[PDB]
Each structure stands twice: as structure tokens, then as C-alpha cells.
Amino acid sequence: AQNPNCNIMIFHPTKEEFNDFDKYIAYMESQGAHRAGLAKIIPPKEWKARETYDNISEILIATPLQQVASGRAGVFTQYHKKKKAMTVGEYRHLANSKKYQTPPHQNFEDLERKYWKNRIYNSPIYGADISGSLFDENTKQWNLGHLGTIQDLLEKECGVVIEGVNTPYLYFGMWKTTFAWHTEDMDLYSINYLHLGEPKTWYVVPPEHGQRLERLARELFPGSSRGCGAFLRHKVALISPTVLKENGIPFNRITQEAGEFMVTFPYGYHAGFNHGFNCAEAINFATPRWIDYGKMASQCSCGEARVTFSMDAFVRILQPERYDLWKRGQD
């Protein structure tokens, strides 16, 4: 078995190997990359996502989210308070203000220590979940707006044509902005490209050990667990690496820098934080190997998780027994 310790693997494809996206994902999996739940892909030196980022300031962040924490430094939840709209140029100036800017630090490890010590005492503002793309239309390789759609993959594997579309999302971050512990909708893959700015640190649990993380979460968030049998779908819970280590939960960590891709694999729980002002683009995708994970994915039916239009068909076809209850949650 390849990669039996479930380490995060880093890949350096050549420009020739960067042509065929599906084939390269399959290659990474042949080397055991999926066992980690997360892989890094460094593009060939010939490749670029677009020519420059000099003209992005007028993009609108319609609903910036202030991420307010509750709990203790290593075990907390966050809620999202909606703020007034602002442009990317306004948000960058805010990120760089004395109130929000990254503190002085020695290296990524020192900054990680400061994040876990101090995150709860601040409320950073995240420009998350903005439909759109920063890839140039002429970028032919690993263009996250030109991938094969999940609806087409389901149709190719299973023969059933379904409604829905699959488009990318932009994330504008600042110091301490946080993504809570989660797997993707319907335990899909994700791919994330860090277009510009400061790094993003990731934590990940191997898919084979995801249920260990879920059992810890039920212990640590006992009211949330009584409320919902899949409350990590709410995407609000944070647990620090120190707490994971104290409870014996297998996990790994890695820092993504500008110009790098990350791929998350089906049922790979992940969480993390931004180091300073940045912009990432991400989208979900599927392969043949995903189908069995989609059929088994947990679902929130309490009403909190509320998701996209296109998830309806995935539940309806892959999980017909659950469909009625899940849809009640959505309505």
C-alpha cells in the first residue's frame, strides 16, 4: 500500500504532465496521495494563472463576514456576522490596518503559535464564498473555471443526466481568518489555488480516520452534537493541533504559498487559517473514485447547513432513502 503513514505529499508536475488534469489526479492517487486527505501541487515554472493581479481592486465583496469566536483558545466555535459591502481594494486596506494586520513574527511556526494562542480574542473579516474566477481564459492547464463538471462525471459513471452547474469561488482573507473543520459537500474533492498574497496554513485528518475526529467533536461540542447528527456540516467548529495531539487524533499540517495548488480528497477533514491579506480560488470536483464516498456521505437535516442548488440532485440520485428528510432541512 502506497503512503501507509498518510503523509501529505507534494508534487512537481512537468508542463507535459500538467496537460491532462484527470490523469494527474489519478497518478497522485497511484502514489497514495489521497491517504493524507490533502496534497500540494507546485505548477511547472512555465505556467501562470494570469498575467498580473494589478487590476482586481474593483471586485465587490457583497457580504464580508466577521468571524466571532466563542469558547477556549484550542476549542471554539465561530459565527459569521454579516458586514456592509466593500471592494477588494477597500478590504485590502482594512486587512493592512493596525487593527487587522499580521503581527511581527519569526517564521511560520511562530505565527502558528500566535494564531492558536490569540485567535479567539479577535474577530477578523473574511471575504469568502464569492462566485467568480481569476484565471485568464487563455490559461489552458489547471484552469479552475474549465474543469469537467460533477454533473457530467455522475452522468458518465452512472448514466443519469441531472440538472445543476459547478462554478468556482473566490476567497479574500486576512490575518486570523479561519476555515472550520469540514469535509466537502457530498464528500467531494476540492482544489484550491492561492492566487496572491500571504500564506494559508492547513490541517487535515486522513480519510480512513475521519470518524475519530467526529467522535472527538461530539465530545467537545456536546450541545451541537445533540442538535444535529452531522453538525460538522455547519462549518463552525475549531479544534487546535495541541488538542488533537492530546486526544490521539491522527492529523498533518502544511502551509500553502502563493502560486501553489492544494487538493483535498473525499472525506478528508480539513481546517486552517490565513496569514495575512490573500486571495484564493476553489471549486469542488469528482472522479470515479468519489462515487462510493458520495453514496455514504453524512448529511445535516437540522436546517443549519443550507447549501447549493446542485446538491439536490446528488442526494436524490446517490442517497434516495435520505432524500425526503434532507430536503425538509433545506426547506
Ligand SMILES: O=C(O)CNC(=O)C(=O)O
Ligand atoms: O480557503 C478556505 O477558506 C477554505 N477552503 C477549503 O475548505 C477548500 O479549498 O476546500
Ligand SMILES: [Mg+2]
Ligand atoms: Mg477590479
Ligand code: NI
Ligand atoms: Ni474545503
Ligand SMILES: [Zn+2]
Ligand atoms: Zn445540522
